Amino acid sequence: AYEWGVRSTRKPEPPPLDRVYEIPGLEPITYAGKMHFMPGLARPVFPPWDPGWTHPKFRRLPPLHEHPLYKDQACYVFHQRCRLLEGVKQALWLTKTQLIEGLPEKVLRLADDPRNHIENQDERVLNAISHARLWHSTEDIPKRETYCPVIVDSLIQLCKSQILKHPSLARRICAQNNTLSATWNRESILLQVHGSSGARLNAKDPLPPVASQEEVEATKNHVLETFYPISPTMGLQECNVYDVNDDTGFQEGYPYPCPHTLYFLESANLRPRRFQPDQLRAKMILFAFGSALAQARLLYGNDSKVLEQPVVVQSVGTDGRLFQFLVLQLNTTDLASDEGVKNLAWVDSDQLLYQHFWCLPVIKKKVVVEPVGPIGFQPETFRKFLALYLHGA
Amino acid sequence: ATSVSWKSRTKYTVMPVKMRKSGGRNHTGQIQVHGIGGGHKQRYRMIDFLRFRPEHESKPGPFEEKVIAVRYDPCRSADIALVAGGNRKRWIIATENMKAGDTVLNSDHIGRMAVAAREGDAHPLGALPVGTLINNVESEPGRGAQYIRAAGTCGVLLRKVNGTAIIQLPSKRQMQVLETCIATVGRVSNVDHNKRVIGKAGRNRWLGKRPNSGLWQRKGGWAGRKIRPLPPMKSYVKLP
Amino acid sequence: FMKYVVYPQTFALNADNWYQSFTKTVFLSGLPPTPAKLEPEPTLDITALREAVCDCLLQEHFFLRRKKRAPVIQDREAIASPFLDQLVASLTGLLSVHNPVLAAAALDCKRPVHFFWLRGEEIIPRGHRKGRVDALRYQINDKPHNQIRISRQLPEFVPLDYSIPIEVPVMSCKPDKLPLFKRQYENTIFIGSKTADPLCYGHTQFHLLPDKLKREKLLKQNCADQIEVVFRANAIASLFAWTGAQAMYQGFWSEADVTRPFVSQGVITDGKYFSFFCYQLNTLALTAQADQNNPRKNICWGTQSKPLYETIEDNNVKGFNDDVLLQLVQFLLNRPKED
Amino acid sequence: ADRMSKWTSKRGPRTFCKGRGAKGTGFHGRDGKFVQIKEMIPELVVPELAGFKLKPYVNYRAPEGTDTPLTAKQLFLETAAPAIEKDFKAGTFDPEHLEKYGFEPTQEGKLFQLYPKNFPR
Amino acid sequence: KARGNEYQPSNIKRKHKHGWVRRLRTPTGVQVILRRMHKGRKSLSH
RNA sequence: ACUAUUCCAAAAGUUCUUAACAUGGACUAGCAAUUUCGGUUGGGGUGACC
RNA sequence: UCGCACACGCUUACAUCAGUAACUAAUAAUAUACUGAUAAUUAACAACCAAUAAACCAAAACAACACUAAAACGUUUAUUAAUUACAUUGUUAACCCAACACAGGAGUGCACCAAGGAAAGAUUAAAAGAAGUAAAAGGAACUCGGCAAACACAAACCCCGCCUGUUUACCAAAAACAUCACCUCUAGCAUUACUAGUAUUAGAGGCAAUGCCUGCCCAGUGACAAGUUUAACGGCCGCGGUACUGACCGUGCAAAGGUAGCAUAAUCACUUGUUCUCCAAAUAAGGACUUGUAUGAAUGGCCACACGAGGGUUUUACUGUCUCUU
RNA sequence: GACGAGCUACCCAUGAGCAGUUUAAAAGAACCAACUCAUCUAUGUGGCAAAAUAGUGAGAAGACUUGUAGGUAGAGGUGAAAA
RNA sequence: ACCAAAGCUAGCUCAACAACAAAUACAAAAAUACACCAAAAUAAAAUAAAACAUUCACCUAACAUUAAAGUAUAGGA
Ligand SMILES: [Mg+2]
Ligand SMILES: [Mg+2]
Ligand SMILES: [Mg+2]
Ligand SMILES: [Mg+2]
Ligand SMILES: [Mg+2]
Ligand SMILES: [Mg+2]
Ligand SMILES: [Mg+2]
Ligand SMILES: [Mg+2]
Ligand SMILES: [Mg+2]
Ligand SMILES: [Mg+2]
Ligand SMILES: [Mg+2]
Ligand SMILES: [Mg+2]
Ligand SMILES: [Mg+2]
Ligand SMILES: [Mg+2]
Ligand SMILES: [Mg+2]
Ligand SMILES: [Mg+2]
Ligand SMILES: [Mg+2]
Ligand SMILES: [Mg+2]
Ligand SMILES: [Mg+2]
Ligand SMILES: [Mg+2]
Ligand SMILES: [Mg+2]
Ligand SMILES: [Mg+2]
Ligand SMILES: [Mg+2]
Ligand SMILES: [Mg+2]
Ligand SMILES: [Mg+2]
Ligand SMILES: [Mg+2]
Ligand SMILES: [Mg+2]
Ligand SMILES: [Mg+2]
Ligand SMILES: [Mg+2]
Ligand SMILES: [Mg+2]
Ligand SMILES: [Mg+2]
Ligand SMILES: [Mg+2]
Ligand SMILES: [Mg+2]
Ligand SMILES: [Mg+2]
Ligand SMILES: [Mg+2]
Ligand SMILES: [Mg+2]
Ligand SMILES: [Mg+2]
Ligand SMILES: [Mg+2]
Ligand SMILES: [Mg+2]
Ligand SMILES: [Mg+2]
Ligand SMILES: [Mg+2]
Ligand SMILES: [Mg+2]
Ligand SMILES: [Mg+2]
Ligand SMILES: [Mg+2]
Ligand SMILES: [Mg+2]
Ligand SMILES: [Mg+2]
Ligand SMILES: [Mg+2]
Ligand SMILES: [Mg+2]
Ligand SMILES: [Mg+2]
Ligand SMILES: [Mg+2]
Ligand SMILES: [Mg+2]
Ligand SMILES: [Mg+2]
Ligand SMILES: [Mg+2]
Ligand SMILES: [Mg+2]
Ligand SMILES: [Mg+2]
Ligand SMILES: [Mg+2]
Ligand SMILES: [Mg+2]
Ligand SMILES: [Mg+2]
Ligand SMILES: [Mg+2]
Ligand SMILES: [Mg+2]
Ligand SMILES: [Mg+2]
Ligand SMILES: [Mg+2]
Ligand SMILES: [Mg+2]
Ligand SMILES: [Mg+2]
């Protein structure tokens, strides 16, 4: 056991007590009388100091066990920034879910409809890319923290323009930074996703379940993958004080009660600061799961049952250059057992919007080889994006 | 005057931690050791040299862990592996062919019948066979391993006497230990570290190494080729 | 070179008269002349929009739970900003079904509007350059809460030669006494979007008022009329820049002047109280040179300050004023003339 | 180098900030915004002057006086002595509780205490 | 190259090296302060 | 002096042993300390001489 | 044509009005610097401006993804954070460090002018000195040397270093040092150096990459453990006889008797060694020859690429260096 | 026995700069500015200057320059040794 | 005739006797926040000895004064 302190650092131990405290019955005479240090006087010891009235700021931090909400049951918290080791695998085991490659076919047929495209699609999306990636900033080369939310919001604005053709879209309201508390029991281990995602799109009307019953029953047979050496819990935050209550960012009787789409941005500049595209997928699976379980226990309640009316949520997530689409159908409120019928997750991953961008003309041998702009454009990714936006109408 | 060492942190972490390098100075500001300074900026990874380290003191038994990744480290010759299991991640020193997506065993258990060693296997010496290749070797049981960490180097178990192992260090000096102590079986990563060639003075400076002096000296008596019979064997066995 | 930073939001005593002095602006109380040329569009639902507006107000001030704040001071800045954003965002789709111009538009979210311009003259008092003649320079750095951008210019509220009995206030002072400060750095002319953008023209803006400038703080400070003026000033600044940028973007400047008057709108907001503004920029030459004989002026029409709601209580909004919604809709329904 | 001149906030770098000796009214806030305490700002207590007759100067032929600086004892005589002889003559004198004459045993009760001297002026 | 310019004035450096504080932090520096008091210097220290 | 060496002693123990400190006395080095570098001399040196 | 601003640093040298006979200006005129009176820079810029637990292995380089030297930068969850108009402080300059109102030293961002500025107190038109332009014919004949200068701005061969780097602030920038490489010695190990390392590692040195090599010597002096070591200090022979030379022979002495190379050298002297080439002529330069009796092998020997503000020689071209000055 | 590392030598933190051209290349590669040094000559020698000026020169993504701020102190420091 | 020149005081020497108040050790003169504090180790050499190696009065201490006495002694004697 090589210890991790360095004696040279560790706060200096008390000077060994002056020997006049070694003599029974004797009164050590100390400089406590002069209220300042003196040599030649023995050194005093002092009562632990008690300012009988407690000042709120300067006081010694309340020891943690003292709290009312404190519980002795270890609880694993997951929040906005938690990093999971095996992203989708772990995500699923925590969630008791199975993943399917493509998006649901309904949303597909939405996307590919000749009718649902904008006026000039490529014009608009290329212009949104160029704006967010270049035109929105004063400086030549903007950073990720600005342009990522700019691109996501610009997409959202191109889709908001569809409300004229499809005026069922007035049913939706956006919400930023929403306290979300979802507590459940999974296989003797207590898991709670607690915190704020970036952006929530709420719908006035719930979402129609996208899985045929065949999918459900076939999901009942699926064997969950196990990663042995790794506890499923790894990448979470242990805690001894938490609240078990089912909360979504809103009180009773909210006019836009049903969570529709969640938006997860990666805005950071450092590579290691962001999420790896896998861990992102995980994070948004668990969170989508949360948004689902919230309503599930709102409209039905804490009882552990399988759902007769399947919940469905969506999530999009972003580098600003690269997207992850996800749709989550909650099928079960009893996850303690491992052997029941499982929720379903569709994930369209790593959908590249553009390849790479150039803000300055790239020049070789006194010629301009490459102009400024995006290289490559996938109308596919946007197609799916709009699609996920349009799913309620 | 006074300086503090950067080496202060209590918690084990996998995350790379920034550190202040000191060319050759002691805590006074004097120069202890010439030649050091101006390296490239380096982070330090916390390396667990105690390979068998039960995660919770509740369940004592033999471990298994997984290799997640293998990375270059600036601090040592050796390549390091990021290994996790249960709820903990830890860096340990990587044996030659350990690759990502892998399984590595730790055990303190001594069976009569010995065992068959994979590379990454950490074991009590006395439970290994008598010709094996070992590295990251501990002095006294529980201490953490000190000997045989460098790149491409490996030691060898010689014989087993009296409930005690005898091994051979890379200096070809032999070492006498209790059999109870843990060692990893194999050779350390990056075995061609020997044959790397510094191309230019620069690379040497990049390593943090400043030139030798320019003061010309005469070679003293001490110079020559010395031929010594081997030094006697180190025994960490304390007699009753 | 050296310039004066002109802030929209200000603690200065009378900023209005000062900024008119800067900008060559003339202030007219009351909304611009109603363009009776309107087609019989108003089939609009005031109940659907009462609904839509109070949705935001209530999500914000009641339903939506934020990680508990220790102040309990319930910052109006952190409170209103999301309400404002979600309000513009919500209303846009709705009114755009009637007014499709807003479907093609891009909404600007907290992004800078810059402007740079020359005005007046100075014999420089101190320095080794003392006694010499220098132009006075200003730079507006703005960060409106929301702007709206379109691909075509908005119709002028009056002709370009239109004149008024009211004259631009000339302050006797140097602006420093306002207070104002000279700090030099890069001078940017910016619309929120680079020149390359397809949307060259501003529609409206939305300025949430900063915490310093809350009403209550002003009445504590023994400041009465200032409550109004704070609004005024802000408009006369931002709008101006907002307009100017556009002009500059079209190739206009102080020596090319302007062919076709530029116009944008603005909405200035303390979370409860609103005010409504229209800027018509005519003269882009404030350089003393072009200025000597220059007849035209720049104009802002504005609304007296006014509440939206009164006293939200327990998921109900007690006080409400349709008037607000009405002029809001007015603004938001403004259109490029069609050919 | 200037040795002789005094050190002021005006001489140093950016980082050097030294107040000229005005008194501090507050503490720093959460956001970094600065916080004032209404109770740290000195509040001047001013009577109405209009109602009374007094002036900044006095008539010249108005007399000066025999100069008696106030002594502890004089004070004791004017205030404490009459009541004291009053209640010793009555025989109701209680050397134990002197509080009826105005004596205060210890000062920590009252608003303005003399010895630790709580009040500015 | 050309010399005599040696003193690059810094206030933080002036007061960190010759500052009253720094003198008091050492027995020797105190001796200095004293020696200067005994000669009645106007300036005890920076 | 000091840094290491090696030793007898001293201390603790066993019936001859030594873990870190550590004292006295020696040894062997390294690092070093104090101090000098005579006179004649057909200038001084080399030679020769006293 | 070194302009504007900031940081640092300077302190009122800044501003207005009045004064200057003299004091500052190295002169005057008048005044940013001398004198007096009186004023003055205003916070949004800047300084001040939270902790304790907890997850996070994954660079910046228009960052797609990678490179090797492995790279500073913060989000969120939880626990408490005095809650309340206005706190305090810096804001002038033509400025600083060089004793000067010094041709010098001075970091950053933007600009090459939209900004800043004057080389000449007045004449005269001597010599000598400084800087510049041009010059017939000639083209290095100058001279230690083509130093400087030029309508030239090309080639070649040498010695020494391998190379980019460093050194004597202020007489030496090199052939010195360092350096990749090669080599010896010393080390078996834990919280302040070395090192949060562990013998492919880390220290004390040596010599200078590559290529071919690196011979014999432990007697002396060290060094290590009596014995062992020279990629430790250090050494590496005579005297005669023989077919002008001496393979061969005698004998002595040494611990071994100097090899492979190389050679009149940056190598005591003799010495301008002998000869060949170069030139009309060479104590120069290159090639050979060569006992250097004082070359010579990691106190490194030998070639060779590239490299050199190193040190020499040739040629082209060019010229006021020179004939010989104007 | 005090005092000095604001110069300079060396670190230690911590900021900042390197345009164009050639190159598959940011390769202790080329060309050439800013920047950095200081070869060679002439001025200058109580100088503009107690080491400068003018030309001329080498390096110029590196063992590179440089800002602020700490650190080592004379029987010592520090040194790509020039005492 | 310029430049200059002269004053006698300021104080000194030796010896006897015996303006609050605020603020100050943050970079002193900055009312106000969580710690640490503090400590000691022969004086040396220059110089005398005609050099320099053992040694070289005073140099710390109080103890004075008149003597014993430059004596007994100690010294590369
Ligand atoms: Mg290292
Ligand atoms: Mg070496
Ligand atoms: Mg050497
Ligand atoms: Mg001074
Ligand atoms: Mg200051
Ligand atoms: Mg300053
Ligand atoms: Mg300053
Ligand atoms: Mg000086
Ligand atoms: Mg300097
Ligand atoms: Mg002596
Ligand atoms: Mg002699
Ligand atoms: Mg003599
Ligand atoms: Mg003689
Ligand atoms: Mg003679
Ligand atoms: Mg002799
Ligand atoms: Mg000065
Ligand atoms: Mg004068
Ligand atoms: Mg200024
Ligand atoms: Mg003249
Ligand atoms: Mg002449
Ligand atoms: Mg001439
Ligand atoms: Mg000629
Ligand atoms: Mg000649
Ligand atoms: Mg001649
Ligand atoms: Mg010649
Ligand atoms: Mg030349
Ligand atoms: Mg010429
Ligand atoms: Mg030669
Ligand atoms: Mg060289
Ligand atoms: Mg170079
Ligand atoms: Mg020199
Ligand atoms: Mg130098
Ligand atoms: Mg020189
Ligand atoms: Mg060699
Ligand atoms: Mg060399
Ligand atoms: Mg020997
Ligand atoms: Mg030979
Ligand atoms: Mg030969
Ligand atoms: Mg010779
Ligand atoms: Mg020889
Ligand atoms: Mg040899
Ligand atoms: Mg040798
Ligand atoms: Mg040599
Ligand atoms: Mg030799
Ligand atoms: Mg080469
Ligand atoms: Mg050359
Ligand atoms: Mg060179
Ligand atoms: Mg060189
Ligand atoms: Mg320094
Ligand atoms: Mg470059
Ligand atoms: Mg280069
Ligand atoms: Mg010339
Ligand atoms: Mg060059
Ligand atoms: Mg070169
Ligand atoms: Mg310092
Ligand atoms: Mg010191
Ligand atoms: Mg150096
Ligand atoms: Mg030397
Ligand atoms: Mg020498
Ligand atoms: Mg005082
Ligand atoms: Mg002496
Ligand atoms: Mg003597
Ligand atoms: Mg004498
Ligand atoms: Mg003495």
What distance in Å separates the CA atoms of residue D102 and residue D76, rounded to the nearest whole number?
10
Q: Which residue is nearest nucleotide H22, judged by alpha carbon to C1' distance?
A: A365
* Number of independent structural domains in chain B: 2
Spell out the residues 6+ positions from residue C274 whose beta carbon is closer than 8 angstroms to its own: C267, C268, C303, C305, C306, C307, C308, C324, C328
Task: Round the CA-based radius of gyration of chain A to a whole number and report it.
Answer: 29
CA A206 to chain centroid: 23
**Is B143 found in the same domain as B91?**
no
CA of B75 to C1' of G195 (A): 10
In a shared domain, residues B73 and B116: no
B136 shares its domain with B54: no
Task: Decide if B120 is inside a domain.
Answer: yes
Write b or e for each residue in D77-108: b if 16 or more Cβ atoms lie within 10 A of its Cβ, otherwise e: eeeeeeebeeeeeeeeeeeeeeeeeeeeeeee
What is the biggest distance separating any 2 CA atoms in chain B, rounded to whole angstroms?
A: 63
Tally of CB atoms within 10 A around A283: 27
CATH number, domain containing residue E1:
1.10.287.3980
Gap from B222 CA to F16 C1', Å = 39
Report the helix count and the strand count for chain E, using DSSP H and E: 3, 0
Which residues lie closer than 8 Å to C330 by C-beta, 6 or more apart? none
A17 C-alpha to center of ligand 64: Å? 45
Of B8, B46, B144, the CB nearest to A9: B8
Which neighbouring-strand residues pair with A386?
A: none
Buried b / exposed e along A127-163 (16+ C-beta atoms within 10 A): bbbbbbbbbbbeeeebebebbbbbbbbbbbbbbbbbb
Alpha helices in chain C, H assignment, sequence order = 15-23, 46-58, 76-98, 101-104, 215-220, 226-249, 288-291, 322-332
In a domain, B196, yes or no: no
Q: Which helix (H) or strand (E) holds A122?
A: helix A121-130
Residues of C in contact with A153 (CB under 8 A): 107, 109
Tokens 């069609």 correspond to C338
Same domain, B98 and B114: no
Residue B234 domain-assigned?
no
E10 CA → ligand 9 middle, Å: 11
B149 domain residue, yes or no: yes
In sequence order, what are the beta bridge partners of C136?
A: C119
Q: Which of A337, D81, A174, E27 is nearest to C92 (CA)?
A: A174
Q: What is the CATH number of the domain that holds B142?
A: 2.30.30.30
Residue B101 lies in a domain: yes
Rounded-to-integer distance, Cα B51 and Cα A81, Å = 30
Which of A305, A339, A349 shows the shortest CA–CA distance to A219?
A339
Residue C119 near residue C287 (C-beta atoms within 8 A): yes
As for how many domains chain E has, the answer is 1
| SS3 category, A29 | coil
Compare CB distances from B87 to A10, A228, A231 and report the shortest one's residue: A231
Give the whole-angstrom CA distance, residue C339 versus residue A344.
53
Cβ-contact B127, B62 below 8 angstroms: no
- Note down the domain range covering B94: 1-107
Q: Which residues contact A225 (CB under 8 A, 6 or more apart)?
A: A89, A92, A93
Å from the A7 CA to the G70 C1': 30
Q: Is B72 part of any known ligand binding site? A: yes
Q: Residue B57: which CATH number?
A: 2.40.50.140
Please provide the distance, in angstroms rounded to a whole number, between the alpha carbons at the two ends of chain E.
Answer: 31
DSSP state of E31: H
Cα C50 from Cα C321, distance rounded (Å) = 10
Q: Would you call B16 an interface residue with chain A, using a CB distance cutoff of 8 Å?
A: no
The number of C-beta contacts closer than 8 angstroms across A and C is 86
The answer on B72 and B25 residing in a single domain is yes
Q: Which nucleotide is nearest to E22 (CA to C1')?
A: I25
Residue with tokens 């919500």, as numbered in its chain: C90
Query: Residue D7 CA to G89 C1' — how many Å?
Result: 14
Are B91 and B152 in the same domain? no
Kindly state whether residue B124 falls inside one of the protein's structural domains.
yes
> Which residue among A164, A169, A255 sits closest to C55, beta carbon to beta carbon?
A255
Rounded to the nearest 10 degrees, what angle do helices C76-98 and C322-332 cross at?
60
Task: Provide the shortest C-alpha distance from residue A94 to chain B (in Å).
Answer: 15
Q: Which residues contact A341 (CB under 8 A, 6 or more apart)?
A: A216, A217, A219, A220, A306, A331, A332
Q: What is the C-alpha to C-alpha distance for residues A162 and B228, in angstroms, rounded to an integer?
A: 89
Nearest to A342 by CA among A153, A253, A216: A216
- Residues B36, B123, single domain; the answer is no
Residue A140, SS3? coil
Residue B102 counted as an annotated binding residue: no
Pair B113, B153 in one domain: yes
What's the DSSP call for residue A269? S
In a domain, residue B174? The reply is: yes
Q: Which residues of A touch B84 (CB under 8 A)?
A: 85, 229-230, 234
Which resolution, in Å, applies to this structure? 3.8
Nearest to A163 among C97, C193, C197 (CB): C97
- Report the distance separating Cα C29 and Cα C166, nearest Å: 12
Residue B69, in any domain of the structure = yes
E43 touches chain D (CB under 8 A): yes
What residues have their beta carbon closer than 5 A to ion ligand 5? D 12, 16
Amino acid at C123: I
Chain H footprint bases within 7 A of protein beta carbons: 1-7, 10-14, 21-23, 28, 38, 49-52, 62-64, 68-73, 77-82
Closest residue by Cα to residue A88 from A319, A283, A262? A283
| List of chain A residues whose C-beta atoms are within 8 Å of the C-beta of residue B49 | 2
Same domain, B70 and B134: no
Rounded to whole angstroms, how far apart are CA atoms C94 and A160? 10
Range of the domain at E2: 1-46
DSSP A134: I
